[PDB]
């Protein structure tokens, strides 16, 4: 027994299909427009939006 919490959460979801033109473009546009470091930062915002949308959908 130790006085520590193990409450840790993943903040991004990887895409189903790894290589797909039309998608890669759309993410690179977002990076290019808002000077983001890597595609993790786009997936982070997609994941947060998705969770807000799922909360709205299950409330409706």
């Amino acid at each position: 027994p130790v006085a520590r919490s193990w409450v840790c959460r993943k903040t991004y979801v990887t895409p189903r299909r790894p290589f797909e033109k039309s998608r890669l473009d759309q993410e690179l546009k977002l990076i290019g427009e808002y000077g983001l470091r890597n595609k993790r930062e786009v997936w982070r915002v997609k994941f947060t939006l998705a969770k807000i949308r799922k909360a709205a959908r299950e409330l409706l």
Partner: protein, 258 residues
């Protein structure tokens, strides 16, 4: 396991103390006394966490061992002594007197009282028995066994005891149209008036209580405590008048105050 348990893990402690996770692994572990381990409050929690007097565990025993704190007009140096419902904690150093009443959301609130009201306490009678040349006896929720009770006192009635003596000043019968308080279950800490009881032989009796704001709820007989005669209470109430107002108007009240 073999023999009785001596420790208590922090997360396994009852929720209405509001101990945080990271402070330690263990908890206070209320010692044996008049009130149940699940439904009491250690003095270490009351002093350190609620009154914000002591910071560490050492400061609490440094307060208590100097004999500045009485419970029901009797000096207790045990920092893990269980003080429960209706118990009057007296600090005669700073001249502050507290009665342990549950608040709306179901926990012991830091409710101060005048020193004049810290003279008596209300108590629910658990049983009534007689023995050894028939001096009848009474037993109450805080384990105070009293000899020669008033024969009008039946089981589930409330009695008012002067703390300096150990004698009954006055008593309230458990009848329809009496002010009660809930001490167990979902409705813990709600004050209201009795409407009726539905006797279920060989099982728990259920009572229906109407709140001051037209809210009607049910509860088991064991989790009822008569506090007033008719509608008028015989003790001071917490900040709120025991009215369970919902999350909607909780938010409205909080946003209105801002």
């Amino acid at each position: 396991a073999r023999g009785p348990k001596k420790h208590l893990k922090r997360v396994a402690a009852p929720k209405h103390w509001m101990l945080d996770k990271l402070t330690g692994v263990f908890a206070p572990r209320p010692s044996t006394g008049p009130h149940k381990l699940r439904e009491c409050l250690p003095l270490i929690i009351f002093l350190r966490n609620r009154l914000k007097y002591a910071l560490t565990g050492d400061e609490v025993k440094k307060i208590c061992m100097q004999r500045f704190i009485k419970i029901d007009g009797k000096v207790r140096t045990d920092i893990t002594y269980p003080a429960g419902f209706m118990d009057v904690i007296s600090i005669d150093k700073t001249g502050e007197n507290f009665r342990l009443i549950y608040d709306t959301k179901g926990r012991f609130a830091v409710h101060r009282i005048t020193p004049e009201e810290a003279k008596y306490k209300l108590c629910k009678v658990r049983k009534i028995f007689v023995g050894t040349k028939g001096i009848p006896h009474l037993v109450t929720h805080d384990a105070r066994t009293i000899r020669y009770p008033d024969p009008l006192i039946k089981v589930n009635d409330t009695i008012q005891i002067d703390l300096e003596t150990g004698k009954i000043t006055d008593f309230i019968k458990f009848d329809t149209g009496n002010l009660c308080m809930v001490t167990g279950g979902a409705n813990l800490g709600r004050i209201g008036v009795i409407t009726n009881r539905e006797r279920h032989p060989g099982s728990f009796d259920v009572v229906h209580v109407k709140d001051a704001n037209g809210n009607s709820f049910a509860t088991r007989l064991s989790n009822i405590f008569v506090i007033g005669k008719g509608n008028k209470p015989w003790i001071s109430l917490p900040r709120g008048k025991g009215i369970r107002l919902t999350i909607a108007e909780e938010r409205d009240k909080r946003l209105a105050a801002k």
